[PDB]
Swiss-Prot record:
Highest classification ranks of the organism: Eukaryota, Metazoa, Chordata, Craniata, Vertebrata
Gene of this entry: LYZ
Keyword Disulfide bond: yes
Active site positions: E35, D52
Reported tissue expression: In the egg white and polymorphonuclear leukocytes.
Protein name: Lysozyme C
Biological source species: Gallus gallus (Chicken)
Function recorded in the entry: Lysozymes have primarily a bacteriolytic function; those in tissues and body fluids are associated with the monocyte-macrophage system and enhance the activity of immunoagents. Has bacteriolytic activity against M.luteus.
SUPFAM superfamilies recorded: Lysozyme-like
GO MF annotation list: beta-N-acetylglucosaminidase activity; identical protein binding; lysozyme activity
Length: 129
């Protein structure tokens, strides 16, 4: 599913991301924009043979199990396929674990480069929440 901007903003709010670990909703929408272009089916293969999955590009080494990645730990206790769903629950729940692991939203390279320190609330302005 390719979410619309406001569609995703509302969904992320319904799943408890607004101000989660101090990160306002626009941070999460901005992260999804620059990680996946709002596409729940997005994937990215890495040099180590791991893959990033879903709207928040969660990696198969530490976080989800894709059965094809060396050094797998599956800390989110989910198949990576669950991160490709139209329902964002699995991606949100795993993202909450990632962001809480000591590194905040710096875990998301796209967020660091295109969202951190900007007027991220622009990503939710104009939307029904």
């Amino acid at each position: 599913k390719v979410f619309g901007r406001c569609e995703l903003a509302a969904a992320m709010k319904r799943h408890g991301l607004d101000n989660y670990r101090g990160y306002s909703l626009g941070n999460w929408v901005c992260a999804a924009k620059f990680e996946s272009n709002f596409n729940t089916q997005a994937t990215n293969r890495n040099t180590d043979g791991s893959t990033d999955y879903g709207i928040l590009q969660i990696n198969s080494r530490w976080w989800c199990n894709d059965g094809r990645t060396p050094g797998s730990r599956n800390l989110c206790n989910i198949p990576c396929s669950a991160l490709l769903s139209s329902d964002i629950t699995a991606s949100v729940n795993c993202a909450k674990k990632i962001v809480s692991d000591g590194n905040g939203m710096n875990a998301w390279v796209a967020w660091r480069n295109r969202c951190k320190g900007t007027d991220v609330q622009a990503w939710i302005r104009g939307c029904r929440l």
